[PDB]
Subunit: 348 residues, 3 copies
């Protein structure tokens, strides 16, 4: 039971990162898994993957295999991807469901709303409860053009978690509804999910790690915006609680999105999604995909993997200095302090 003070990182001008145990402890991870990831809205996809009846996707986060499915009735729902009879998985990959889901094991059959449609011989089983033998649901919400799930069925909506975010994202990219998935990079990353957020929250490393008429990192309520000018081309980098990042590069007509799906204390599954409105890509778009694939993302992944190894050394003396400057300049690290102050509230 590692603990942090309430004002941890409350003053970004004099602040340090978490004691290293928070990036490595399996007990810390189990606490964050239940207190954060099982109670927060988790972004899983852009709405375009789920726009048509019978569309489905699958996702894996904190050990939970989830199916998100647009019903025959065009209603979006989410379920745990596990049969309520004896635990076989139900669907794999993504695509179009048939009009019923059939369990591979004993062929219990479910409508796309999760209701049990047919369970062989169940009229002969004593005290069989057909309603309450349905697929088990999660909360799902379409917000800001993206799709969020929540394992806490008592949760309130995404706007309560990210006040003002949808409004500001739509003022960064006006064509979100027209975006389509152009490429996805899936990486099982050997770093704690918070190291990856840390790395996003600063541009201190842009230049020395990646070979702008002012850059402002403003904090909001459970999200932040890195904003500036590269006409007058704007760029936007949004971090949202707990760990989904939305990038709107200069031009504001496409997006990249980083989805972090934590696995354990030192492992995070990442989706890096690239979205364009074209369904047939231009050469510029194809080259951009290859550049993200071969250069930009390998740089960022090598960084977090090396940091995760290095922070375990006894020569790394507990914590690292957050290099915040008084002027909140473009190379100031103060965004890390805002993130870590929010995390600290879950370790009281």
């Amino acid at each position: 039971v590692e603990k942090l003070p309430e004002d941890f990182c409350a003053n970004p001008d004099v602040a340090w990162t978490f004691p290293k145990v928070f990036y490595t402890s399996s007990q810390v991870f189990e606490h964050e898994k239940e207190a954060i990831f099982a109670k927060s809205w988790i972004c899983v996809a852009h709405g375009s993957e789920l726009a048509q009846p019978n569309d489905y996707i699958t996702r894996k986060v904190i050990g939970e295999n989830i199916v998100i499915i647009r019903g025959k009735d065009s209603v979006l729902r989410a379920f745990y991807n596990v049969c309520p009879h004896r635990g076989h998985e139900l669907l794999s990959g993504s695509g179009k469901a048939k009009n019923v889901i059939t369990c591979p094991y004993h062929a219990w059959t479910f409508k796309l709303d999760g209701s049990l449609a047919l369970a062989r011989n169940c009229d002969h089983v004593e005290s069989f409860d057909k309603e309450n033998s349905s697929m088990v649901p999660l909360k799902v919400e379409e917000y800001a053009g993206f799709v969020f799930i929540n394992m806490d069925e008592n949760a309130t909506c995404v706007e309560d978690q990210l006040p003002g975010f949808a409004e500001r994202l739509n003022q960064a990219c006006g064509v979100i509804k027209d975006l389509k998935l152009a490429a996805r990079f899936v990486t099982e990353t050997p770093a704690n999910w918070k190291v990856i957020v840390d790395n996003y929250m600063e541009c201190y490393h842009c230049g020395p790690a990646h070979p702008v008429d002012k850059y402002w990192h403003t904090t909001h309520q459970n999200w932040t915006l890195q904003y500036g000018f590269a006409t007058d081309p704007e760029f936007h980098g949004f971090w949202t609680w707990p760990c989904t990042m939305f990038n709107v590069p200069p031009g504001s007509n496409f997006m990249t999105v980083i989805y972090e799906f934590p696995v354990d204390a030192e492992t995070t599954l990442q989706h890096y999604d690239i979205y364009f409105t074209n369904e047939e890509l231009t050469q510029d778009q194809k080259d951009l995909i290859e550049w993200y694939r071969n250069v930009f993302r390998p740089e960022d992944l090598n960084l977090v993997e090396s940091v995760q190894r290095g922070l375990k050394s006894r020569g790394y003396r507990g914590q690292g200095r957050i290099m915040t400057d008084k002027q909140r300049s473009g190379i100031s690290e103060h965004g890390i302090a805002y993130f870590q102050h929010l995390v600290a509230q879950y370790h009281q």
Copy 2:
């Protein structure tokens, strides 16, 4: 220390599988390892692998490397496959031993009864005890044409564990002594040993998982028999405590046997052995081997691997309903309840 009630699954008509912790907990596994697998008779082979003087085999179960060896004197014995000097392994694989076993490390030499024959310079070591520096034995018994070991040297015989089993197996296949190993499939299966037993104990999935003038699943004392008619061809499927299954398909002139050698809470080493009386196989027999290899066994392994993943989900709500019908029909799951009631007696 997870616990179960004495009457757990005592009424198969209204029964559920174990709470999921029993399929996943390393503490549950350590308890079952010592209370079940280190005290029960464990089937390891058909007698034909060990029929001649100097024949030996090796097996690995619950972390124990065991050698079973027919001596020069034609007496069957079993030992731990570890040198009593400083712990080097003694034999590997299976085949014919030489007339003494020589340790690869310092060449202590043992007769095939485990007695130390020669230990270099041991007459010069103070208080060296040559008897009690022999290989360490286990109990072994030839029963029903198969070979069983027991790590508990105070154990009584296999018949006390499986009353009536040998008598009934010989009334299923009359030629067991003439069988010879025709093929063996070795698989390290990522499922708890009890998931694999569960899967064997029901034919609810035959049809939906594997593309009969009545089928009866009768329980006995620590074993069960699935029996019916496919002349009047009979079929037999025996499960025996703790987890060896003997199949005698229609025709009753060959057998397949499933040996489960648990490794840890989520890992079980399986041998799937196919036995025919012919030493030169017919084309029907060769095709059957390839069908078991490419189709039938991959189906059954995919099932248990998916169940092991799915039962860990928080959307799998603890336990699964055992679909027993009042008529004990061929698709009734009641065999699972008998098995799990027996397991529960070890978790008091």
Copy 3:
């Protein structure tokens, strides 16, 4: 908290190896990691790898990535290979450093003495401490022609740990300063570090495991010497606390050195280094390297890997007899008792 008596193995004539838990327990390993490996001098290299200004090497031991670097000023130093800003690793492999070390993450720049030279925007960070943001040092000492590190900065010199060793090693090989690394075999060995030492400390297995006008194994203070005659060619095998072994074969003009860098209870990284004074190898030397590579070392590695597996069996009854003879002959195992008596002093 496993414990051993003070006189454990104090009488080699009647002695047994550690109870098996000391070779397998992660708690025992964590204790030895902090009480032995973080407080003792650890040999890492021959001086020839570090002889010139800007020469550096890297090593990994008990989870610590260490850089040893000869400065521009020709002073030998050692540091933890981790940036003090936010934990990125600094250098990899071995070779010649540039005149400053630049962190790949945010390009903090260090002189080769570890001093911070430049940290971007640090004059704008409140209460930034530039001295105490340097690389974190370890102790390093050149002793007997080899290079030792110590994580305990209060440690005294290598001679206090190994009294008389340098003097005796120089009386085994008179040309240590002229040796150069000719080959290195790196192996991640699945055996506890003490099994590997045990194996070195006896010649009971030479002959039965590896297809001499007296052989004497004399103990000193934290090191031992295996000495004899194969003119009158001498051979020397030194073991030094905790686990570096120095071999000077007949002829006394070359050396091999075994470096053990423990990883966890059942894993040890080994360097097997072969040193000759020639920089252009003779055919005899090339063949010797290939013989060590293909025959001699695979024998010794197979032995310790099999022992590590075998000692976990319940058929290995706790401990093994150390086969010491009254005459302390060449096949006497008494060297194991001296080593294990020293280890026992850390488990009081």
